[PDB]
Design a protein around this ligand. Sequence first.
Ligand SMILES: CC(=O)N[C@@H]1[C@@H](O)[C@H](O[C@@H]2O[C@H](CO)[C@@H](O[C@@H]3O[C@H](CO)[C@@H](O)[C@H](O)[C@H]3NC(C)=O)[C@H](O)[C@H]2NC(C)=O)[C@@H](CO)O[C@H]1O
Length: 376
Amino acid sequence: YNLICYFTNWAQYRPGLGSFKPDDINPCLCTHLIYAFAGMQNNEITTIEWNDVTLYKAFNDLKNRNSKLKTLLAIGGWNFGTAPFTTMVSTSQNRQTFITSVIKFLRQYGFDGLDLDWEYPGSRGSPPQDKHLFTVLVKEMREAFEQEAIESNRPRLMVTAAVAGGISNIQAGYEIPELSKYLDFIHVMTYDLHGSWEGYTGENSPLYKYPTETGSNAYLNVDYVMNYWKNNGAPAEKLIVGFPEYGHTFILRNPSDNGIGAPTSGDGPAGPYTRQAGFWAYYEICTFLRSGATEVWDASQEVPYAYKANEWLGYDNIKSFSVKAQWLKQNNFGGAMIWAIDLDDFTGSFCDQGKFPLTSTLNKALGISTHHHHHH
Ligand SMILES: CC(=O)N[C@@H]1[C@@H](O)[C@H](O[C@@H]2O[C@H](CO)[C@@H](O[C@@H]3O[C@H](CO)[C@@H](O)[C@H](O)[C@H]3NC(C)=O)[C@H](O)[C@H]2NC(C)=O)[C@@H](CO)O[C@H]1O
């Protein structure tokens, strides 16, 4: 199994103990590290942060401490939107400009592959023809990577993609059978399945449907989404399950109504380190759980929630990560990906569960290991 760990290049700006840079990563925990995010200018890949070159070197230097580790660079993300991708895929000239720039960029800075994170082809302003043009981009990039590997006598650069977990976005965005032939791995974003945008409480990454969910609401769980990909053309071995190391917050419209589906008024307050209303990192959640919160196990969905007065949290913990790791192995998927390693309790100071409790849970559950001693 693979354990793919996203690192974000804005985590460095979090105050105090929240600040996270590549040297904070334990190089032995994951099999792959993905750097989020690169950008695009004139149809060529580019940096986005003033010190990305510094962080790239620290990131890829981690491989000097773990000879099995591979790294990838992710391009796009939510805030990046779709317009640059649409323009870039619109013509063969623009796709060639981009692919050529990626090969040079990844080889220059020491990456082993590119993770495409277009959110999403066919949606958020992207026109309908981008569903097929995304397939064409991926096909041409895989082919260019295969040729560069042979021409440079190096292992081939990987091409992966982070893909939607919402059924409407999946249907609008991806030609799953053909896309699956050319991608090395498919990182399915099985999180953000509920959130304050819906006007009621729900879990971020429930494994199973809630018993009274009907219609499209019954799609909003890891089981349905992973099996949708699997049964519409993607090989299980290429499918990677998304694991969030954060939770979503809500303000309850009525504190006594604090179950799944309780009505809500909006996002919960920003955390002191992540400073974005609507979510908390796992280490921030641990502080919340020590501040008087009530913890509840959502038994049907195999995830926890918690609440305190008018604040409600749907999240993941060691137990839910363990249950879902067991599940993905039984279903023969390729492994797990984590959004994001800088949201774990990387210092060990917040949760009293050791360093990197959630990521370590998956490392153990998936049997990640590179140090063999040849004796008891
Ligand atoms: C408004 C909203 O919640 N939209 C959801 C998108 O966030 C999500 O996109 C992917 O998931 C993660 C986690 O949500 C995204 O991380 C966000 O990245 C932006 C920069 O682009 C940063 O400003 C946010 O702080 C950060 N949020 C968190 C909790 O870390 C990430 O960009 C996207 N890529 C990956 C691999 O996860 C999509 C997933 O389908 O759902 C929307 O509902």
